[PDB]
């Protein structure tokens, strides 16, 4: 198995640093820490990336990331939970959504749940004896439940603490047959407090975009991402909170279905701006620059064409499509997206 110990080391250091850091009103997860989280989830997936032929889902659900049968033999899972004589597992066992007040608690709880295949209620996403089931009624619903609980749990914290910007996404494989509009309306129609402009703004932005742009756009797809067989399509600009939230990388397989220009932002630069790679033609868009370190790495795409609904153009505005590293200045809607700062940026090609 391909086990990237580097992201386990970085994750451990992040939790040590932030364990007793109180979540205040504007507290957010830094670029470095977001990239560590992102790496951890992707490395977890890569260690045991496919189901076994004798134990697979006839619905095509990716059980290798959803069941104890696979996760307990995933060497990345095992190495992470055993790291430092199991000290993160010891801390993890003290946590639940209702008592979390600190950054490191929040990150450890959300991420260890995901890379253990556990809901916040402690149930596994899917049961082992259900791997081979063709009953879509409970297979699809279990995954909707798991996806919604990742996001709603975080909104429950944000509302209790009155925090604006903490955010970890539900990774792309947990959207198996999940309707984004229903997720959004289910959660927001049921809790008026989540609508407060000072509560859960990146969670809101992530779910809102997914409520208006479905996973598979068929003939309207302009872009397609694939990581370990999990695909996703887009026809708008793709903000960093989407790529970070879903666990996609600008180094994954990216296919263009139109001749529209895209600006693929990949790293911060040394003049307070960002460096991007431009692609134009149909076909595979391959970033061949070195992968930036966690301090500097960005994942974001601005799509340029003449047919985007005016109400959706703001997703590509510079200071919305990339998450501000100064927490209080993060943008999350058309009412505060701005498009200044381009002087500081550079086309790499």
């Amino acid at each position, epitope marked *: 198995q391909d086990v990237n110990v580097a992201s386990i080391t970085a994750f451990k250091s992040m939790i040590d640093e932030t364990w007793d850091k109180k979540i205040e009103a504007n507290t957010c997860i830094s670029r470095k820490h977001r990239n560590i989280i992102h790496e951890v989830i992707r490395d977890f997936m890569k260690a045991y990336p496919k189901m076994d032929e004798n134990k697979k889902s006839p619905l095509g659900a990716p059980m290798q990331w959803l069941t*104890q049968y696979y996760i307990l033999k995933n060497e990345y899972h095992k190495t992470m939970l055993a790291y430092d004589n199991g000290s993160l597992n010891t801390k993890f066992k003290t946590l639940n959504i209702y008592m979390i007040t600190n950054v490191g608690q929040y990150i450890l709880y959300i991420v260890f749940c995901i890379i253990s295949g556990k*809901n916040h*209620d*402690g*149930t*596994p996403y899917i*049961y*082992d*004896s*259900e791997i081979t089931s*063709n*009953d879509k*009624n*409970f297979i699809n*619903e279990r995954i909707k*439940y798991a996806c*919604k*609980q990742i*996001l*709603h*749990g975080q909104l*429950t914290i944000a509302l209790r603490i009155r925090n604006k910007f903490m955010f970890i996404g539900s990774p792309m494989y947990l959207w198996f047959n999940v309707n984004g509009s229903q997720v959004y309306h*289910d*959660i927001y129609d*049921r809790n008026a407090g989540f609508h407060n402009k000072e509560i859960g703004r990146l969670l809101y932005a992530f779910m809102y975009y997914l409520s208006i742009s479905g996973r598979f756009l068929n003939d309207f797809a302009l872009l397609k991402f694939t990581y370990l067989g999990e695909s996703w399509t887009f026809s708008l600009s793709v903000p960093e909170y989407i790529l970070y939230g879903l666990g996609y990388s600008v180094f994954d397989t990216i296919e263009k279905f139109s001749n529209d220009a895209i600006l693929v932002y990949i790293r911060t630069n040394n003049r307070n701006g960002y460096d991007y790679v431009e692609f134009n033609k149909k076909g595979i868009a391959k970033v061949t620059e070195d992968k930036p370190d966690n301090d500097k790495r960005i994942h974001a795409i601005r799509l340029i064409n003449d047919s985007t609904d005016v109400q959706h153009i703001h997703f590509g505005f510079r200071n919305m499509v990339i998450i501000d590293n100064e927490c209080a200045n993060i943008q999350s809607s058309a009412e505060n997206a701005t498009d200044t700062g381009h002087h500081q940026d550079s086309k790499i090609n």
Partner: antibody, heavy 126, light 108 residues
Framework: EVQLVQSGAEVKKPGESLKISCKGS????????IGWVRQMPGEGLEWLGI????????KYSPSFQGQVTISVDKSINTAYLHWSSLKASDTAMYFC???????????????????WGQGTLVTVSS | EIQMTQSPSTLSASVGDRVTITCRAS??????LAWYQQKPGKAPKLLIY???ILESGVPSRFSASGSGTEFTLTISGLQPDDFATYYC?????????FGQGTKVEIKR
């Protein structure tokens, strides 16, 4: 107050069709799922499937898919369980029960509600 | 849904006894477990939901606890109308499979 009233005992032959009913009163009928569960003589309980009366969305256990139909008549607050062709192995007591519209949400799961229906005994013999 | 194992199948007890019925699963059901009582020819009656919460109207001699993989229903002082069959039921499902049942009978 809340009652689920089921139709009377049935005595049928294999191959005959049958429709039994569950009448819900004293609550919002269109916004609670109705589930059907059976208990064969001397056995435990086994679910057949459920229906949401507001829009008639149905979810069948794979054991019963294609062999029964569940339906509703909203005008009389009635849910139905139908066979086009009974088997002798369908001899059992049939219960109905109701469940909240969101039987799960992002915070957890919700149980089937009391009271259940009183039960309809179906006897299938040649 | 997942297989549950309910035990014992028959519990022989007396009025006034503290009796315990157990339900186990190989993976966690969290709190999503109910307990039912059933008497001959009658519909099951809900006693407990969310693994430990008494259904409204159920007498306080009934209680229950859960760890996720092990669940216990305790009747703290059996009374003359508690002889019946009891079922656990998982309900983190659109259906929710029942345990095999426990008959509580009069000991002599």
């Amino acid at each position: 107050e809340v009652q689920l009233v089921q139709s009377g005992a049935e005595v049928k032959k294999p191959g005959e069709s049958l429709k039994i009913s569950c009448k819900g009163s004293g609550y919002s009928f269109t916004t609670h799922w109705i589930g059907w569960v059976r208990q064969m003589p001397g056995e435990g309980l086994e679910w057949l499937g459920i229906i949401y009366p507001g829009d008639s969305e149905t979810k069948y256990s794979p054991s019963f898919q294609g062999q029964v139909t569940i339906s509703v008549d909203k005008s009389i607050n009635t849910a139905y369980l139908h066979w086009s062709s009974l088997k002798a192995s369908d001899t059992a007591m049939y219960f109905c029960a109701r469940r909240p519209k969101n039987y799960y949400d992002a915070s957890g799961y919700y149980n089937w509600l009391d009271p259940w229906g009183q039960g309809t005994l179906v006897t299938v013999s040649s | 849904e997942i297989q549950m194992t309910q035990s014992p199948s028959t519990l022989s007890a007396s009025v006034g006894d503290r009796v315990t019925i157990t339900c186990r699963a190989s993976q966690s059901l969290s709190t999503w477990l109910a307990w039912y009582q059933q008497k001959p020819g009658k519909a099951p009656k809900l006693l407990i939901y969310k693994a430990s919460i008494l259904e409204s109207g159920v007498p306080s001699r009934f209680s229950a606890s859960g760890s996720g993989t092990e669940f216990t229903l305790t009747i703290s002082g059996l009374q003359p109308d508690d002889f019946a069959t009891y079922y656990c039921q998982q309900y983190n499902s659109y259906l929710g499979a029942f345990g095999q049942g426990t008959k509580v009978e009069i000991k002599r």
